[PDB]
Structure formats: C-alpha cells, structure tokens
DNA sequence: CTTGTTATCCGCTCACAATTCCACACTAATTACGAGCCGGAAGCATAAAGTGTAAAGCCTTTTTTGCCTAAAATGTGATCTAGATCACATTTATTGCG
C-alpha cells in the first residue's frame, strides 16, 4: 500500500541505526569472553562436550548485551551471566 | 668476501604389536528445588453393523447291537478194512576194475 520509491526510504535508514548499534556491541561480546569460560566449569562432564558448552554461553552474552540498560542499578557482569547459565 | 646448494643433524609427526586351545574367580562416580502446566491413557460403559462362535433342534446316513430261524455243519463210539510207525539187520542192485 506504499509507493515503490518511498518504501525504500523506510528500510534504508533502518540499516543505519542497526549498524551503529551492532558494531558498538561487538566490543562487549569480545572483551567479555573470559566470563563465559568462568561459569563453564559447572556444566562440564555431563552429556555435552566442552567445545559445544561455550556455544550456549556466547549466544547468551550477545542477548543480555542487547537487553542491557546502563541506566539501571544492576551492573553488566551480573545481569549478563544470568542468560548465559540459562542457555 | 658473499653467496648458493648440499649434507648431516635434530626433533617431530607419523605409521604401526602374529607362538597355539581351555578352565577357575572377581567388578562402577556426578548438574538446587518447588509450583504450575499440558500431556497421555486408567480402562469406563456405551453402541452399532459387522463379523465369527457357541448352545443343541429334528433330519438322513453309518454303524453295532440283539434278534429269528432256514439251511448247512457237526460229535455219539464200537468194528472194521486199508493205512501208518519205529530201529538198524541183512540183502539187494547200481555203475566199473581187472
């Protein structure tokens, strides 16, 4: 129900906001890889290998960083490790 | 003097255990719990057309039974001729020999 010319304008500016945020979150999911292996000692030999253990650990950190609020009393080193041990 | 290829050396990843049967005896650790949720099935009686089972109800055919009796098979024993029986004693005829 939109013009083929203007419909592109809506999406072209969405790739700008998601890009400035994506690259900005690539620095938090790289310097915090030490916390993933830290709590990865509670689910070692059980049924899944260690190589596939930090798999659900890295995906969890990338989820918490997105739903994180710097304007909140709780820090990140505690709020992020919540979704990690959940995956 | 500097440069190259080549030879020797090392540590490394790599490929690589072969005399031949059986018997007896023995053996395993670990991820926080509780409340709420949807799940399968506990096997419940239901009910129907459909199916295949299970009583025994008179017919017909087979098979054992008891039957009757007309006609054929079956002892009676004392006398009497045609038959049989043993053992191993002595007499007889067979083919040749000389």
The phi and psi torsions of A50 (rounded to 5 degrees) equal: -75, -30
**Which of A81, A86, A23 is closest to A56 using CA atoms?**
A86
Query: Resolution, in Å, please?
Result: 19.8
For A85, the token pair is 């041990």
Residues 6+ apart with CB under 8 A from A76: A28, A64, A65, A68
Residue A68 near residue A80, CB atoms below 8 Å: yes
Give the count of alpha carbons within 13 A of A36, CB side only.
Answer: 21
User: Integer distance in angstroms from CA A20 to C1' B30?
Assistant: 46
**A46 CB contact with strand B at below 7 Å:** yes
Q: Which nucleotides along chain B are within 7 A of a protein C-beta? A: 29-31
Sign of the Cα pseudo-torsion (A52, A53, A57, A60, in order): positive
Which H or E run contains A60?
A: helix A55-64
* Residue A24 backbone phi and psi in degrees, to 5: -75, -20
């Amino acid at each position: 129900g939109l013009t083929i010319e203007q419909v592109k304008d809506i999406n072209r500016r969405m790739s700008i906001g998601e890009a400035k945020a994506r690259r900005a979150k690539k620095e938090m999911v790289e310097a915090n890889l030490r916390l993933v292996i830290s709590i990865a000692k509670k689910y070692t030999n059980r049924g899944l290998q260690f190589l596939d253990l930090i798999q659900e650990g890295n995906i969890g950190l990338m989820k918490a960083v997105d739903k994180f609020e710097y304007r909140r009393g709780y820090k990140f080193s505690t709020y992020a490790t919540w979704w990690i041990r959940q995956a």
